[PDB]
C-alpha cells in the first residue's frame, strides 16, 4: 500500500481538522495523492463535519467517513443518545486498508485525543494505527497544560509500538507570550515539531491555505512520508 | 509509616488544590491528621499559593514546601526563567517521606498533571508517588475532553504500578449540562467517582467549606485511608 498517517491530539479542539487540512494541501502541492478519512464524525446535529472542512481548506476531493452522530459528544456519548451503536474494529480498519493504496498519504482523523472510543469495546485510534500499521501524528497546543498532555499522549503511543510522527501545534498566535514560546520550545525537545500552524489558520480561503500550507512544513518531511 | 497519597490531576486548573482541601477536610473530620506537602510552586508573583488555600480551606497546619518561582509557569519553565534549578528527587521524596507518620493522611500535591516535571532531572510526580509508595487520587473535570485526558492519565499511572484512589470532579456545574452529565457517568465506568466539588467551591469560607467537603466524600472511604 502507501502511507497511513493517523492524526490525533492532545485532547479535543486543538486542530486536528485544521492540521488534517494542512498536511493534505501540503503533499498534495508536493504531488502526493492524499485520502482523508473520519471514522466517527460526531456533532453533526450542529453541522461538524471535518470531511468537510478538510475538502474547502485543502481541496481533497478523496474523502471516506463512515459513522455520523447528532450530537456533539464523546463517540461513545453521542452514540447512545442517539439509540445507535459505535461502528465496529474491523469497520474502520476496513475503511482506511479500501482508501490505503501506493504513492497516496492516506489521513485517518480521530474523535478528540488519542484513547477516545471509537470502536466497541474501549476500541481507540492507536489500536486503529497498530491494526493498519500507521504511525501517529500529534496535535497540540501552545496553551498551558500542553506539556502534560503531550507527554502522556506519546506514552501512550509508545505503550502499543505506536511511532510518533511528530507533533503539529494546531494554532500558534503571532505573537507568542511568554508561555507559547516556553511550550513550543520545550515541545520540541519531547518530539520533532513538524509545523506550527498560524492562529486562525482555518479562516483563510483556498489559496492563503495552501500558501500557509506549503510554509508550515519542511518539504522534505513531507515529500519523505510517501515513496 | 502512615498512608502516603499523591494527588495529581488529568491537567492544569482542574482543582488539584480544591480537591487537596477538600479531602483534608474531610479526613480532618473524621479525626484524621492530615499533612499536604507541596514541593514545587509557581505563580507566585501573582499570589499562587496553593499551601495558603488548603490552610485556610481546611485548617491545615503541616504545610511543606520547598520552592516557589513568580512566573505562572510549569515548573520547569518558571526556574528555566528564574534562573534556578528545581529541588532534588532526593529532597522531594525526603521531605514527604519525613511528613509521612502513622496516623496522619499526608497529601502530595504536584503542578499540572501527573507527568510534568518536578525535580532534576524529568522528575515527575509519579515519580515520586512510585518512590514513596503513594497512591494516586486524579482530579478531573467534567467538561468536554475529560474522558481522553483521564484514561491517559490511568494507563500513566498503571505503566508504573502507580495503584489509583479514584477520581475526583474538581468543579460540578449547575445546572449540569449533557455533557458534564454524561461525562460524569462515562468517568465513573473508568474508575471510582469518589466525590464531585461543586462549582464555586473555592471562594466558600472555612465553615462553608468544610461541611461542603463533609459531604461531598463518603465517611467510609475517608476514615479508611488511615
Ligand atoms: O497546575 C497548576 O497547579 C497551576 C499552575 C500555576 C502556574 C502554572 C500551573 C502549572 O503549574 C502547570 C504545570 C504544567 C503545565 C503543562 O503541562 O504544560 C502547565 C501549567
Ligand atoms: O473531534 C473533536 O475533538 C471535536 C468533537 C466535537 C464535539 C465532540 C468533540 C469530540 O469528538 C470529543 C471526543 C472525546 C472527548 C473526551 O475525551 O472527553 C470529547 C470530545
Redesign the pocket.
Known amino acids: 500500500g502507501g502511507t497511513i498517517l493517523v492524526v490525533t491530539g492532545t485532547g479535543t479542539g486543538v486542530g486536528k481538522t485544521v492540521v488534517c487540512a494542512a498536511l493534505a494541501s501540503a503533499a498534495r502541492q508536493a504531488g502526493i495523492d492524499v485520502a482523508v478519512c473520519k471514522p466517527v464524525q460526531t456533532g453533526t446535529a450542529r453541522g461538524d463535519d471535518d470531511l468537510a472542512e478538510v475538502g474547502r481548506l485543502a481541496g481533497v476531493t478523496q474523502l471516506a467517513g463512515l459513522a455520523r452522530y447528532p450530537q456533539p459528544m464523546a463517540p461513545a456519548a453521542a452514540a447512545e443518545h442517539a439509540g445507535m451503536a459505535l461502528p465496529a474494529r474491523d469497520q474502520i480498519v476496513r475503511l482506511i486498508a479500501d482508501l490505503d493504496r501506493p504513492g497516496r498519504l492516506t489521513l485517518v482523523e480521530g474523535a478528540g485525543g488519542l484513547l477516545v472510543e471509537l470502536a466497541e469495546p474501549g476500541v481507540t485510534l492507536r489500536d486503529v494505527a497498530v491494526d493498519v500499521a500507521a504511525a501517529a501524528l500529534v496535535v497540540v497546543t501552545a496553551d498551558?497544560?500542553?506539556?502534560?498532555?503531550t507527554?502522556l499522549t506519546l506514552e501512550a503511543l509508545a505503550a502499543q509500538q505506536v511511532s510518533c510522527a511528530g507533533l503539529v501545534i494546531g494554532s500558534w498566535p503571532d505573537p507568542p507570550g511568554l508561555?507559547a514560546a516556553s511550550?513550543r520550545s520545550?515541545l520540541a525537545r519531547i518530539a520533532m515539531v513538524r509545523a506550527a500552524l498560524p492562529a486562525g489558520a482555518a479562516s483563510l480561503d483556498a489559496g492563503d491555505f495552501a500558501a500557509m500550507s506549503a510554509a508550515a512544513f519542511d518539504r522534505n518531511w513531507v515529500a519523505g512520508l510517501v515513496g
Open positions: 498551558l497544560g500542553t506539556l502534560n498532555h507527554k508561555v511550550n520545550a
